[PDB]
């Protein structure tokens, strides 16, 4: 009565899709996410979960803007255009 026929009654969701991190870790009755922490102002990371800081940190996504920083540093943050030389 505590094994398979109790797994019978099990049709609801404690968690649904987080809006910030998109993981199904967002607790419905609590109204908070367990993986990232939404709707907190922060994003929860703990030094005991060093693999969490491997999964969810910088470099793991697209880096839609940081990718063009070091390149943009190398030129000393140029502004303007370029001239034409030959051919």
Partner RNA sequence: UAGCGGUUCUGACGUGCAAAUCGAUCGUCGAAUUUGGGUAUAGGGGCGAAAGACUAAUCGAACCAUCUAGUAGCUGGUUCC
Partner RNA sequence: GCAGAUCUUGGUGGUAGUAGCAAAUAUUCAAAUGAGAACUUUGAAGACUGAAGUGGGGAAAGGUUCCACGUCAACAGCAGU
Partner RNA sequence: CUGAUAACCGCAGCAGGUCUCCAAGGUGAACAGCCUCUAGUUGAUAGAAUAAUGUAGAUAAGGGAAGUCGGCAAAAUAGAU
Partner RNA sequence: UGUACAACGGGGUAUUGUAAGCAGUAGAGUAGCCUUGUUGUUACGAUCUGCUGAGAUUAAGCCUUUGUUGUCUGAUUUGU
Residues that bind RNA (CB under 7 A): 1-14, 28-30, 48-50
Q: Measured from the CB of residue 59, what is the shortest distance to RNA in angstroms?
A: 21
* Distance separating alpha carbons of residues 62 and 76, to the nearest angstrom: 24
Whether residue 20 is annotated as binding a ligand: the answer is no
Give the count of beta carbons closer than 10 Å to the beta carbon of residue 26.
24
Of the candidates 60, 28, 33, which has an alpha carbon nearest to the alpha carbon of residue 44?
A: 33
**DSSP at 71:** H
Contacted by 1, from other proteins, RNA, none: CB < 5 to 8 Å by type: RNA
Q: Which does 70 bind (CB under 5 to 8 A by kind): RNA, other proteins, none?
A: none
Interacting residue ranges for other proteins, rule: CB under 8 A: 16-17, 24
């Amino acid at each position: 009565g505590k094994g398979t026929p109790s797994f019978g009654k099990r049709h609801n969701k404690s968690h649904t899709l987080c809006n910030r991190c998109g993981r199904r870790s967002f607790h419905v009755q609590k109204k908070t996410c367990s993986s990232c922490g939404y709707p907190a102002a922060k994003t929860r990371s703990y030094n005991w979960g060093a693999k969490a800081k491997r999964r969810h940190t910088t470099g793991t996504g697209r880096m839609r803007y940081l990718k063009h920083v070091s390149r943009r540093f190398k030129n000393g943050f140029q502004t303007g255009s370029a001239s034409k030389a030959s051919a």
